[PDB]
Design a protein around this ligand. Structure first.
Ligand SMILES: [Zn+2]
Lengths: 171, 187
């Protein structure tokens, strides 16, 4: 068709160019040259310059030109630790391991380096969710304690019996 | 809402429950009443995961829930689940669990001696002292289980009993901070 597809090639070419290490911004016309979009329509050019290249979260407007956004993406261990801490502080939630691996190349080194600082939750589809390890208050017990705790059923006991136990034992 | 109640709730949730339960309590600590839908978005947890956690929280009655029904702008009925922390019930449940654990410890001490002291390896089943006498045959002159006719060793029963004694001191020591918090929350 028209007016909606040429943008994808621009984004992908921009993504591939960034992977090569070219952080320098690129003009709309310059990017069009290498994407075989010299015949791109005029009303398409303005739409990209006004909406597509600003609304997207991976496009940075620098000195008028447009450049990738590696700063938002995690590309080092420190950002991963800082990013996770911010989510816990603001209660935004965890991030899937896939979102970090794509943003952070060789994320295994960062994950293993931080070690226990990251809490991993395994989704049914094998997907892993990362959460900050809040080391403020920590407490754990032996597996025997947890097994004993589970053996003490509490869901199937009514409030009347629960509170009656308190006076039964004299407390 | 004295800070003592919040501290006690945080200590118990972070000690006897997983991180998921603690995160849910944190939202309710910041705001007394919070919608179930809002909590799901903030935590980004799975719908089933949050529901299972909420049911567990309701099971221990740490936080109560109220159902509000209203008509939305588009006209479709909306039923929201509002969760609020009830410290009055939370302290009672915590007190119930602590005493139940304590009475479990004292009863467990007697349960150790109640365990059978005779075990036949051939049958692989426990044998009581009373049953051991019955199995003994006066004609034979030695005590063996009639079913398998094998010697019985009582050394195995001794080992598990010693383990429980060590747990007594550790359990009492590790639970002191919770007791101190309870005393501070009596007012
Ligand atoms: Zn026997």
């Amino acid at each position: 068709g028209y007016k909606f597809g040429v943008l994808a090639k621009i984004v992908n070419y921009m993504k591939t160019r960034h992977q090569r290490g070219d952080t320098h911004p690129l003009t709309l016309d310059e990017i069009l040259d290498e994407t075989q979009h010299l015949d791109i329509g005029l009303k398409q050019k303005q739409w990209l310059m006004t909406e597509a290249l600003v609304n997207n979260p991976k496009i940075e407007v620098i000195d008028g030109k447009y450049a990738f956004k590696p700063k938002y993406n995690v590309r080092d261990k420190k950002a991963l630790l800082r990013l996770l801490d911010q989510h816990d502080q603001r209660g935004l939630g965890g991030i899937l391991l896939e979102d970090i691996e794509e943003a952070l190349p060789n994320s295994q080194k960062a994950v293993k380096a931080l070690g226990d600082q990251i809490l991993f939750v395994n989704r049914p589809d094998k997907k892993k969710i990362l959460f900050f390890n809040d080391k403020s208050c920590q407490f754990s017990v032996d597996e025997e304690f947890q097994k004993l705790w589970r053996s003490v059923t509490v869901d199937s006991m009514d409030e009347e019996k629960i509170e009656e136990y308190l006076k039964r034992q004299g407390i | 809402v004295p800070a003592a109640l919040k501290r006690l709730a945080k200590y118990v949730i972070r000690g006897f429950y997983g991180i998921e339960h603690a995160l849910a309590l944190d939202i309710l600590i910041r705001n007394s009443c919070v919608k179930e839908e809002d909590m799901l978005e903030l935590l980004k947890f799975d719908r089933k995961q949050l529901r299972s956690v909420l049911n567990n929280l309701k099971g221990d009655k740490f936080i109560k829930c109220r159902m509000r029904v209203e008509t939305a702008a588009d006209g479709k009925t909306t039923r929201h689940n509002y969760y609020f922390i009830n410290y009055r019930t939370l302290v009672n449940v915590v007190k119930y669990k602590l005493d139940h654990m304590r009475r479990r410890i004292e009863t467990d001490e007697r349960d150790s001696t109640n365990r059978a002291s005779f075990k036949c390896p051939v049958c692989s089943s426990t044998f009581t002292d009373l049953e051991a006498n019955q199995l003994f045959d006066p004609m034979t002159g030695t005590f063996r289980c009639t079913f398998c006719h094998t010697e019985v060793e009582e050394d195995e029963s001794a080992m598990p009993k010693k383990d429980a004694r060590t747990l007594l001191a550790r359990f009492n020591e590790q639970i002191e901070p919770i007791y101190a918090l309870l005393r501070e929350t009596e007012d």
